[PDB]
Amino acid sequence: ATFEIVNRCSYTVWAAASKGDAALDAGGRQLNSGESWTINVEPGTNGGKIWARTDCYFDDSGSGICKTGDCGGLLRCKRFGRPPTTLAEFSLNQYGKDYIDISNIKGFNVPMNFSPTTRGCRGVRCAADIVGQCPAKLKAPGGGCNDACTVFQTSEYCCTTGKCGPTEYSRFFKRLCPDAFSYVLDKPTTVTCPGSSNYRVTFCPTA
């Protein structure tokens, strides 16, 4: 499948793409405002993620540090990023269907739009001012709005027993971005698309 990754933010972001155990394509790249990066992901990819990182320094060997979404200090991510990160998640060619969603289970950093560029399904979006409204206990000094698991490490917020309910924190993310997963057991806002679809992810889709 082809993913085009479009930075519509006024600020530079460092896009990242991984399936946890490896890079997807180059794994990461700088995107200045308006730039687009087209990547190829292998059919059958299960548990792929896309996100933006903010405020990154990298040396000439591709080593450094971002304030949100850092993936062990590399430009080209092999691993998932440090929260807070708004996540585009996908599993492709799963019994003939692709499954997409946006998640705030690991917090929020940049607003996003994750849509098909082929026919047969709808996109999803989380484009509210979650950082501006974030609660002080979840505000990340680095930038962004953490999830309450990250911060408090309780069974309830992390859903460690497999039984958990929504919370004051999860409801905050849900109130602002109802189409994004707000906690691990939220009613699914997964979208099922035809197998082998192509997509666009747009950072700051409205500004």
- How far CA 144 is from CA of 67, 85, 104, 132, in Å, comes to 9, 8, 11, 9
Distance CA 98, CA 60 (A): 37
CB atoms near residue 40 (< 10 Å): 11
Cβ-proximal residues to 54 (8 Å cutoff; 6+ apart), any chain: 11, 13, 14, 66, 67, 68, 69, 109, 110, 143, 144
Tell me which H or E stretch contains 6.
strand 2-7
Instruction: In whole angstroms, give the CA distance from residue 150 to residue 158.
Output: 8
56: closest CA among 38, 22, 81, 88? 81
Record the resolution, in angstroms: 1.5
3-class secondary structure, 197: coil
Domain spans, the chain:
1-207
Closest CA to 182 of 115, 102, 111: 102
3-state secondary structure of 29: strand
- Reported as half-sphere exposure (CB side, CA atoms, 13 A), residue 23 has a value of 14
> Which CATH architecture group holds 1-207?
Sandwich (2.60)
User: Residue 76, SS3?
Assistant: coil
Q: Which element (helix H / strand E) includes 17?
A: strand 13-18
Residue 84: is the preceding peptide bond cis (ω within 30°)?
yes
